[PDB]
């Protein structure tokens, strides 16, 4: 295990033959040394004789307690599971490194001495926020933007996949990225393409669930979010619909607008605090960019500000080519009449028509979609 990290010649040289044959002698001499322990001092079997001695030391009932402090001369104040806490001692088979205040431990039943530590069963909120698998298809599913698809790779993908271009420049990557525009243009759609592509851990939270019903439970939820994001990996924190923290007032929140405010002060800390930040990239998205606090959008917290426009009428035709790719489309239809139907139909409307017109065909058990399917589709989707 991690015996030698040198692999650098990478050929059929004698140097690769020399190094590993040196290591061959460092292993056998270490083998033959430790072999002569049991030859002259048998004294045990050591596969079980030390083990069963430990297993007979530790009692068969094993109570579970809680750490709250350590005094490093192998005795610490531990809390029992009722609430009455003791001043028991710690053993030597305890590996006194995995002990934090709040870690669940194993105790003796007789004198309650700290026998072993317990691996924690965590968590019912990490698995909530952590995206399990890659969501959907690739960047080729998008179509039409092609100017900011370069931009997001520039700040997320390319700092991760090519860590040589910023070094030859002598620069650090831009920190924050926000995404804004009208509703239904592809803000949430682009973030799935990033989570398809990346090898980082990807955390998502919606801005509406940042507000809590108790006092101070809001800023506690933010502090432990960035704790989770930092403790894993190079990671990507995606916060969607963050204007919703300030627009909608809910009667669950006992603190009024001045509990929204204290949460945003904590969020204002966690992006550009004084603490050592680490490798965490922040992506944000909204559709009401003018409402939120300008102190949160200052450079240093969010560097890149990407606008999404409405789909142009030659980018619209590309979107119909995507959502009607794998459907058995009858040759009656003409897509170019469908394009200029609404003058500002978003990319969401195109999928809203193409999914609905397929639903009309299954009412009549058909397999191909005709023209009058689309004729009654935009009446159903748009006009109400």
């Amino acid at each position: 295990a991690s015996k030698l990290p040198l692999v650098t010649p990478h050929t059929q040289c004698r140097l690769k033959l020399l190094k590993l044959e040196r290591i061959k002698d460092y292993l056998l001499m270490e083998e033959e040394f430790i072999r002569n322990q049991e030859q002259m001092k048998p004294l045990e079997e050591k596969q079980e004789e030390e083990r069963s001695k430990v297993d007979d030391l530790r009692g068969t009932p094993m109570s579970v307690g809680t750490l709250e402090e350590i005094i490093d001369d192998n005795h610490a104040i531990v809390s029992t599971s009722v609430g009455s806490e003791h001043y028991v001692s710690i053993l030597s088979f305890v590996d006194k490194d995995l002990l934090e205040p709040g870690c669940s431990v194993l105790l003796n039943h007789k004198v309650h001495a700290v026998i072993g530590v317990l691996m924690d069963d965590t968590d019912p909120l990490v698995t909530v926020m952590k995206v399990e698998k890659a969501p959907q298809e690739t960047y080729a599913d998008i179509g039409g933007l092609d100017n900011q698809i370069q931009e997001i790779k520039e700040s997320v993908e390319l700092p991760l996949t090519h860590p040589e271009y910023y070094e030859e420049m002598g620069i650090k990557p831009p920190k924050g990225v926000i995404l804004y525009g009208p509703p239904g243009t592809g803000k949430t759609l682009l973030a799935k393409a990033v989570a398809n592509q990346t090898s980082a851990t990807f955390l998502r939270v919606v801005g509406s669930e940042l507000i809590q019903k108790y006092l101070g439970d809001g800023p506690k939820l933010v502090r432990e979010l960035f704790r989770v994001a930092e403790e894993h990996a190079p990671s990507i924190v995606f916060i969607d619909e963050i204007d919703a923290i300030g627009t909608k007032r809910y009667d669950s929140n006992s603190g009024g607008e001045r509990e929204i405010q204290r949460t945003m002060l904590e969020l204002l800390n966690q992006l550009d605090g004084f603490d050592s930040r680490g490798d965490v990239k922040v992506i944000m998205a909204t559709n009401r960019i003018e409402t939120l606090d300008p102190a949160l959008i200052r450079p240093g917290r969010i560097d890149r500000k990407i606008e999404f426009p409405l789909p142009d009428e030659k980018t619209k035709k590309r979107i119909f080519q995507i959502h009607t790719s794998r459907m058995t489309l009858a040759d009656d239809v003409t897509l170019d009449d469908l394009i200029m139907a609404k003058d500002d139909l978003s990319g969401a409307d195109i999928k809203a028509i193409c999914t609905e017109a397929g639903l009309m065909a299954l009412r009549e058990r058909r397999m191909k979609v005709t023209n009058e399917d689309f004729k009654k589709s935009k009446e159903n989707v748009l006009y109400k």
Partner: protein, 394 residues
């Protein structure tokens, strides 16, 4: 030539490492055990020494002593209160009242005094580790640094120039300006160079869920701070901890004002804090309370304004001293294009213009690579700008 011959002689000896380390004992990936050849000290001896002679000594809390006799009144977590006595191994000296002690399970007598409870959410806000911002990175505001550095560290590094002159130096200082100006940046340089404990407090951490729970956290801060010989408290974003008392009708934000009042009492009056120096940093000072803006608490009122011209030209030299540039560019021309800009924006210009070199192919930025960055950062992100409604501090 010897393609497989260097491979299989490599591969078996990498296996022969594993094939005999399984015959020593590091294996059986545990549920909380030790490495096997590390606990051998307590294998026979301290097994029957740290367990069989040694006892459990359940820990308690003492109410009071009484005269003429030991006769201590003790208290435990949920059970009763007892009348106890000492052991032979401790003097009756350091068994002073209101102190946690360990107590056997049969006779109920006191074994050893204990260090008190530290309330661990205050334990996590001691910094333990220093950041890497030097005063050489806070260029452009030298006069503000000098007027700050003479309060925080010069009575600590030389506590004799003041005493022989007979003056008591100031204690409190707040740092205020528009955002992105250098307040949190200049606070990191102080924790770089200093040597006392540097306990940081973000003002959004004192909002608690119960009533008066936020005010007890202020004390446990100032209890462990008085134990130290010198400590340096840092308050950040204190517009959340208290603006002003305005109580009207339905008592709203009454809870946060009591936390703001307990902080006021720990700063002045009645056997003061001693050698504790505080340091606030806010974004809008006009909301703050007049009894907190009073000197004797917040003596120094250092301003962080925008850089003038030579503040700006110095900041370009800081954030572009470490990047591959064309030799023949002038920074003084660039700082005339950013009239009311912050130091955080100037760093974003320098990082953006290095990206344009990465956009096409090249390895060193040009002067026109800078100018394509200025009109994007200064003039195309000017819809947001964050400054002009904070210059008036509203």
């Amino acid at each position: 030539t010897y393609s497989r011959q260097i491979k299989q002689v490599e591969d078996d000896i990498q296996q022969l490492l594993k094939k005999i380390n399984e015959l020593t004992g590091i294996k059986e990936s545990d549920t909380g055990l030790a490495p096997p050849a590390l606990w051998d000290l307590a294998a026979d001896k301290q097994t029957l020494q740290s367990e069989q002679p040694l006892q459990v000594a359940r820990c308690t809390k003492i109410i009071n002593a009484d005269s003429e006799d030991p006769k201590y009144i003790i208290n435990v977590k949920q059970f009763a209160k007892f009348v106890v006595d000492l052991s032979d191994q401790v003097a009756p000296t350091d068994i002073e009242e209101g102190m946690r002690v360990g107590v056997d399970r049969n006779k109920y007598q006191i074994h050893i005094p204990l260090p008190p409870k530290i309330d661990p959410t205050v334990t996590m806000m001691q910094v333990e580790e220093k950041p890497d911002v030097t005063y050489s990175d806070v260029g452009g505001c030298k006069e503000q640094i000098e007027k700050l550095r003479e309060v925080v560290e010069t009575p600590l590094l030389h506590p004799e120039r003041f005493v022989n002159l007979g003056i008591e130096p100031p204690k409190g200082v707040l740092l205020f300006g528009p955002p992105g100006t250098g307040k949190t940046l200049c606070a990191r340089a102080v924790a770089n160079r200093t040597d006392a404990c540097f306990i940081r407090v973000i003002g959004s951490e004192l909002v608690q869920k119960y009533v008066g729970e936020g005010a007890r956290m202020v004390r446990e801060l100032f209890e462990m701070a008085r134990t130290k010989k010198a400590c340096l408290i840092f308050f950040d974003e204190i517009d959340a901890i208290g603006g002003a008392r305005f109580d009207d009708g339905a008592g709203g934000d009454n809870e946060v004002q009591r936390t703001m009042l307990e902080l006021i009492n720990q700063l002045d009056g009645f056997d003061p804090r001693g050698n504790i120096k505080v340091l606030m940093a806010t974004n809008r000072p006009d909301t703050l309370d007049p009894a907190l803006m009073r000197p004797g608490r917040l003596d120094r009122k250092i301003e962080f304004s925008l850089p003038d011209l030579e503040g700006r030209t110095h900041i370009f030299k800081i954030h572009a001293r470490s990047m591959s540039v064309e030799r023949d560019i002038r920074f003084e021309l660039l700082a005339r294009l950013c009239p009311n800009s912050t130091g955080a924006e100037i760093r974003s210009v320098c990082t953006e213009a290095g990206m344009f070199a990465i956009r096409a192919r090249r390895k060193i930025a040009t002067e026109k690579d800078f100018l394509e960055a200025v009109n994007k950062v200064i003039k195309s992100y000017a819809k947001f700008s964050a400054t002009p409604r904070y210059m008036t501090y509203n």
